[PDB]
Design an enzyme around this catalytic site. Structure first.
Site, short mmCIF file in Angstrom:
data_model
loop_
_atom_site.label_atom_id
_atom_site.label_comp_id
_atom_site.label_asym_id
_atom_site.label_seq_id
_atom_site.Cartn_x
_atom_site.Cartn_y
_atom_site.Cartn_z
N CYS A 92 18.24 45.26 49.86
CA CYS A 92 19.43 45.86 49.27
C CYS A 92 19.96 47.00 50.14
O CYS A 92 19.19 47.74 50.74
CB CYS A 92 19.15 46.31 47.85
SG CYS A 92 18.82 44.93 46.75
N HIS B 230 21.81 51.42 42.42
CA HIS B 230 20.53 51.12 41.79
C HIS B 230 19.32 51.69 42.57
O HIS B 230 18.20 51.60 42.07
CB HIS B 230 20.34 49.64 41.42
CG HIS B 230 20.15 48.70 42.57
ND1 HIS B 230 21.06 47.70 42.84
CD2 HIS B 230 19.12 48.59 43.45
CE1 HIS B 230 20.58 47.04 43.88
NE2 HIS B 230 19.43 47.54 44.29
N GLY C 241 13.68 45.10 49.16
CA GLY C 241 13.92 46.14 50.14
C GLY C 241 15.12 45.86 51.02
O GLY C 241 15.55 46.77 51.74
C1 LIG Z 1 16.98 45.24 46.75
O1 LIG Z 1 16.20 45.80 47.78
C2 LIG Z 1 16.66 45.99 45.46
O2 LIG Z 1 16.83 47.18 45.25
N1 LIG Z 1 16.17 45.08 44.56
C3 LIG Z 1 15.77 45.42 43.20
C4 LIG Z 1 16.66 44.81 42.15
C5 LIG Z 1 18.00 44.51 42.42
C6 LIG Z 1 18.79 43.87 41.48
C7 LIG Z 1 18.27 43.54 40.25
C8 LIG Z 1 16.96 43.85 39.94
C9 LIG Z 1 16.16 44.47 40.88
O3 LIG Z 1 14.84 44.81 40.66
C10 LIG Z 1 14.09 44.06 39.69
C11 LIG Z 1 12.81 44.78 39.45
C12 LIG Z 1 16.16 43.78 45.11
C13 LIG Z 1 15.83 42.57 44.50
C14 LIG Z 1 15.94 41.40 45.23
C15 LIG Z 1 16.36 41.46 46.55
BR1 LIG Z 1 16.56 39.85 47.53
C16 LIG Z 1 16.68 42.66 47.17
C17 LIG Z 1 16.59 43.83 46.43
#
Ligand SMILES: *[C@@]1(O)C(=O)N(Cc2ccccc2OCC)c2ccc(Br)cc21
Ligand SMILES: *[C@@]1(O)C(=O)N(Cc2ccccc2OCC)c2ccc(Br)cc21
EC number: 3.4.19.12
Lengths: 304, 304
Positions: free
Chosen positions: B145, B41, B143
């Site tokens: 992830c 992603h 951030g």
């Molecule tokens: C992580 O850094 C990341 O990329 N991200 C974005 C994300 C991940 C899963 C589902 C949706 C989504 O974005 C929504 C706009 C994300 C989200 C939450 C956390 Br704790 C880490 C990360």
């Protein structure tokens, strides 16, 4: 979101851990630049610990009696000296892995990470707090002496603790990196009891702010209180008295959540008076006091 | 003595953390040998996450669109491929800091350390357990992830987890290092609810053994029970059913303390039925389930 008892990444500290042997005693040393720091009781036999005279015991030791091993390579010891309760072994090689560092003496209530080591090798890492009675509730077994406590500001490691002793109560005593013990303990196998372990009030409030940020809100009430009123309750429950300095450090948390510090004090007061009634806050069934206001800001903002 | 929620020393993993950027999205990557692993992603805009077609989204991406930075040096990307929910970026340089490593898919109930990272830089380290509903109760902000979970056997790092998602409940979902999600979650911004978070019974018993070893003994009773009797109580309190495999893994702890596994089950049973009556066990006011029998043996013996 989510809130965890987090330790600092320990890589910078792992690169400093060495093994120190003097006679039949082996413990951990901290190698920074061309100096290895370790507890002076490395020169003691378990028999010597009842009543040691470190200056006299040290007269019998020469540079060559201190065996310092970094992983599998042997460091050449070119000098030794005793500073308070630590030994300083000057080696002929600067540790190529020395990070940017400082030696700091922390205040009670402050938290730090411990890299528990055995024979110069790291076993694990956990978060600690210097209790108000100057002990730490650690996890240390024989051979863990010399393991260090630290905090990290970006790339700088601030060493604050070095492990020396286990009290007969299973709590831990040690020094800062200049060899001075926190609290009244001495490096001697004698009856040393710790004082009252009071709860670090400012840390509990900060952790209540971390809980509101992460969705645990049930403990928020319709009340407020005053520093003097709150402190009467804090005294009854052996909590540290809250000062205006503590209210000030809680300012950013108060600002971001919109909950005034004295309103949070009133939540804490009701929780002290009524308990949690089988409920939990950030997965804990007791009031957590080992997160400072800085730790909460750091974790809730993503500082690296 | 003393018992702490300890994480593995994270140095070996810190040396693998890199930053990966694709367009406006930045997350963490894991650099091992000449390959950088990161959540697929990274190729998505926050708009794409509602319903992404990763294969289609990937057709628009070339090697040069994946910016991989290790600290301050830029890695040259010579290949990219999608394996399940992870991307594999072949770089032209083997990571000189690659430790000995394996990729393992852990079972629910197993614990691991998380090195939380932001923009390729470590923020902290904490212990986790894969919940029976295949979520982890982590501490992750935007951030984070790409941050990984791991265990270490002497010098070998077994990577088990890579962080991908936060559920609307504040719990966390992710994959093993082959890109397969633990549990039923998908990398999509959709309503995904977690199942019942049952308590890992074998871990609670192991932690009761850790408590007896460290002096917390008040919960020991005059009773015994049977696997079937204990399990009726375990069912009533949404605890995992105890099996003979669980009794077997608890053997060493049973052996060293002299408390038969079924006697400890009866202590656990009374604690479930009666609560702790304001008392604590290893500084906790709830029954801790994120220490496996191996973690307890490791901590209570001083393994490095
Ligand atoms: C992580 O850094 C990341 O990329 N991200 C974005 C994300 C991940 C899963 C589902 C949706 C989504 O974005 C929504 C706009 C994300 C989200 C939450 C956390 Br704790 C880490 C990360
Ligand atoms: C630590 O490794 C160490 O050297 N040691 C021995 C010691 C320390 C203080 C007082 C007495 C004494 O030895 C008694 C024979 C020690 C003891 C406990 C722990 Br948790 C670590 C270490």
């Amino acid at each position: 979101s989510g809130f965890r008892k987090m330790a600092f990444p320990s890589g910078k500290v792992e690169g400093c851990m060495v093994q120190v042997t003097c006679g039949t005693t082996t413990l951990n040393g901290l190698w920074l630049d061309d100096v290895v720091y370790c507890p002076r009781h490395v020169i003691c036999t378990s028999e010597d610990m009842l009543n040691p005279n470190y200056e006299d015991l040290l007269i019998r030791k020469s540079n060559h009696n201190f065996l310092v091993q970094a992983g599998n390579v042997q460091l050449r010891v070119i000098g030794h000296s005793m500073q308070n309760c630590v030994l300083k072994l000057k080696v002929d090689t600067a540790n190529p892995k020395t990070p940017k560092y400082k030696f700091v003496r922390i205040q009670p209530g402050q938290t730090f990470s411990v890299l528990a080591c055995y024979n110069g090798s790291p076993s694990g890492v956990y978060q600690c707090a210097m209790r108000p009675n100057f002990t730490i509730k650690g996890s240390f077994l024989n051979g863990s002496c010399g393991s260090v406590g630290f905090n990290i500001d970006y790339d700088c490691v601030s060493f604050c603790y070095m492990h020396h002793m286990e009290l007969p109560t299973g709590v831990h005593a040690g020094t800062d990196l200049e060899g001075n013990f926190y609290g009244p303990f001495v490096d001697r196998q004698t009856a040393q009891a710790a004082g009252t372990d009071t709860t670090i009030t400012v840390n509990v409030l900060a952790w209540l702010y971390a809980a509101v940020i992460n969705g645990d809100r049930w403990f928020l009430n319709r009340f407020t209180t005053t520093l003097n009123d709150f402190n009467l309750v804090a005294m009854k429950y052996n909590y540290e008295p809250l000062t205006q300095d503590h209210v000030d450090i809680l300012g950013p948390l108060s600002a971001q959540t919109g909950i005034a510090v004295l309103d949070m004090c009133a939540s804490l007061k009701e929780l002290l008076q009524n308990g949690m009634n089988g409920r939990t806050i950030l997965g804990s069934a007791l009031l957590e006091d080992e997160f400072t206001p800085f730790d909460v800001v750091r974790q809730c903002s993503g500082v690296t």
